Structures are given as structure tokens and as C-alpha cells.
Amino acid sequence: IPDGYKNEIDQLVKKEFANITLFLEEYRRKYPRIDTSRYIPNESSEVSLLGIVDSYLKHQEIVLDTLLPQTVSNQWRINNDYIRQTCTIVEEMNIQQRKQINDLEIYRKR
């Protein structure tokens, strides 16, 4: 009985039981360390010149040189093909485990 004998035996087993890094782990408490929230805002009228040039121009020039297209979609789709080779390998192992698992149960059945 998948509802009586298991419940019965469980009670009998129950009755016999009645008889018988520092920085990382601390951050886990649930707060990430704040980063530099400075570069994005700034102010023309406000304080500090370096922020204008020591924050925005050079990074924007590096951005415009970095922000690209020369290769475009070819570099992306080349990596997409690699992901498909990686995926099929896992499912082949899913099969190999599936066959040997059923094979062991098959021997028990006899």
C-alpha cells in the first residue's frame, strides 16, 4: 500500500527513534559594497573639473573607439555556434546515464 503499510512501518521506525572569505561571508548578510556613483552625473556649474575630463571625455573617446561593428554580428554568431557544440555534448551524457540506469534496473527485475 502506497498509503497504509508505509505509514504503518514509518510509525514503527519512529518508535525506535523515540527510544534512541571574511569580507565575502560578511557581505552575504545581504549588502553589496557601493561603487563609484560619480562619473554619470557631474555638473557644469558644480565643483570639480577633473570629473569633466578626468571622468567623461577620455572614457567617451574610449567608448566610441570600443563601441563597435567592424566585425558586427559575425563575431557573435561564431560564438553562438560554439554554444550549440557545448549543449549537445551534455544531452549525449544524459542518454548514456539513461541507458545504464535502465540497464541496472533491468538486471534487478529478473
Binding site: 557644469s44 575630463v53 571625455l57 563601441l67 563597435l68 561593428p69 553562438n80 550549440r84
Partner: protein, 36 residues
């Protein structure tokens, strides 16, 4: 600051054009992200 206002305008308009054209591979991203 005005020089940068020129750059922010010229560079960001090019970045917005480059970004919208690229679209984060948004179809290739979904292709790549759904495979992940």
C-alpha cells in the same frame, strides 16, 4: 564642459545609432541566452 557637450552629443548620437543598429544582437542575444 561645452567641448564635452559637443562630444556627448556627437559621440552619444553615434553610440545610440551603433547600439540600435547592433541591438545587443537582441535576436542573436535571445538565440544565445535561450541556449544558455
Amino acid at each position: 564642459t561645452e567641448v564635452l557637450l559637443e562630444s556627448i552629443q556627437s559621440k552619444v548620437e553615434s553610440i545610440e545609432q551603433l547600439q540600435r543598429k547592433l541591438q545587443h544582437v537582441q535576436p542573436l542575444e535571445q538565440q544565445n541566452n535561450e541556449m544558455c
